[PDB]
Amino acid sequence: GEELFTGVVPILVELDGDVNGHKFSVRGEGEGDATNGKLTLKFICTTGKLPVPWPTLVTTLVLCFARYPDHMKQHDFFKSAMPEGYVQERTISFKDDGYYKTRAEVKFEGDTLVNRIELKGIDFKEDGNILGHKLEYNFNSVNAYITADKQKNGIKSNFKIRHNVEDGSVQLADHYQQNTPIGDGPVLLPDNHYLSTQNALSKDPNEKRDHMVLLEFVTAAGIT
């Protein structure tokens, strides 16, 4: 699928969300550049104010844009499943608070990479760090290990996200993740390795709707 990622690819992101009953929606657009492992996207909450902090939706809101070094192109399951795509599915468990369950299909719709997400949030404390909006507007870099899931012909990953709390503590969110291809072509089941993600969160001075401007770098590493 790498032939589809040699240049700048436009991105659409749509998420329908429900946490402790409140319904919100988010739409973003932007572009990826798997050559630099670079991602640029801006998201707006088209239902009003975001009921959760923006940094907790970042992982949910396109790993086919990772830069797989040329000596690791055979371990790039994400691009190999394209253009038919894959399902990305996660549990996100906020320590001492609620959890997210997310299901997304990531696929080429015409020439655009589309990521469409259903997110459900359950059992959150009305005064915890999530519904309380007590998290700093940033996102800590992480290295997440990828391993094949032969029984499902895809991959899995689990890792820890640490959100900074404003009071100087840390709000941990355990991520459990499974990817399986949508189509039936052969794909590349990878040797173990990891992806390194770094994210800069900003604001748009000329936007008065709830929004997030995101700059993401993703790189693969950990082979021979």
Compute and round to an integer the Cα radius of gyration of the chain: 17
Strands (E), the chain: 9-19, 22-33, 38-45, 86-94, 99-109, 112-122, 142-149, 154-164, 170-181, 193-202, 211-221
66 backbone φψ class: left, alpha, beta (φ>0; ψ -120 to 50)? beta
- Tally Cβ neighbours within 10 Å of residue 77: 25
Q: What does the alpha-carbon distance between residue 46 and residue 86 come to, in Å, rounded to a whole number?
A: 26
**Separation of alpha carbons 76 and 28, rounded Å:** 25
- 160's CB contacts (< 8 A; 6+ apart) are 142, 172, 173, 174, 175
Which method resolved this structure?
X-ray
User: At 144, which amino acid appears?
Assistant: A
Say if CB 165 and CB 129 are below 8 A apart. yes
CATH code at position 55: 2.40.155.10
Nearest C-alpha neighbor of 58 from the set 221, 213, 180? 213
Could you tell me the residue range of the domain that residue 24 belongs to?
2-221
* Domain total of the chain: 1
Q: Which secondary structure element, helix H or strand E, spans residue 79, and what is its range?
A: helix 77-80
Q: Among all chains, which residue has been given the structure tokens 């390194």?
A: 196
Final resolution, Å: 2.2
